[model samples]
Target: SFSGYLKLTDNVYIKNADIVEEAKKVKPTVVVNAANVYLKHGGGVAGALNKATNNAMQVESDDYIATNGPLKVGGSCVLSGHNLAKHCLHVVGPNVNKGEDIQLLKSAYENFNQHEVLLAPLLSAGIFGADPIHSLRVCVDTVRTNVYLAVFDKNLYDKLVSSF
Candidate 1:
């Protein structure tokens, strides 16, 4: 039931909510997963979304990778959202210390602009090790169209509220 938001611009907002639930409520929306290069959908936001959708997320991801090959850092691919959403945007967030981490993280967010309503978690800010505050800023500046950032952490959510 946790949900809050800070409006950033016209049609853009940074939201604190359960990404899976928020995504389920929208039609024609893309749920962006902070993923690994393998599209594992294992742990964190990726795992939760897959579990909520009864593993359809993983099935599609497996098929996609098998057909298209593993996703590269900062690269993205779309998956059928099955019952929970219209589409899933799998973005392989960069692990910290990579030379292009910042630009690649921006690319991940930038790739989903084609969809008007996008539900995204804080990319690369978890086990991937990007600084949450810095990552949040990159997301704030790079987004186009209507974007809702689904931040699950209270501290990071507060940071976004006070800052971006």
Candidate 2:
């Protein structure tokens, strides 16, 4: 799964790797958390990240929401990383079941485009119930950096391999 990638440009690519592993890098690779509006690191990628960071990120995000209210769909917030990384960018993606706008999903990835050396996941494609194809497309089109998309779905990975 880690061996494949879809190169979009000299600076952009789609690769399969482990986000948790990438976040453990000693350098400045900021891990992207597919967070909810409330910034609760309750489950999924957010939960794992919070666990990995010794719950430091959870404390930071809780503080953020206490001050600024719930983050809007497509809005973002940053938390100080612990353990290995120093930064974790939290982006709120749309949930189809909640009747949220799909455009905000694109906006989430747009926020990601501003950063380099990112390790990202398929936002909203998990419990949030977004279409993987659309989510992946938005990620590929919007993120302009040398980003690595940590995909865990083999069906989706195979689909991308053929299409790209």
lDDT of 2 by residue, 37-121 (tens): 9988888788888888788888888888899999989988877767746678898999887999988888888888778677778
What pairs collide in candidate 2?
A: none
Q: Candidate 1, residues 103-160: lDDT per residue as tens digits? A: 6888877886777777788888877788898887787688777777878877778877
Number of backbone clashes in candidate 2: 0
lDDT for predicted candidate 1 compared with the true structure: 0.78
TM-score of 2: 0.87
C-alpha local distance difference test of each model: 0.78, 0.77
TM-scores, in order shown?
A: 0.88, 0.87
RMSD of each: 2.6, 2.6
The regions of model 2 sitting more than 4 angstroms off are 1-6
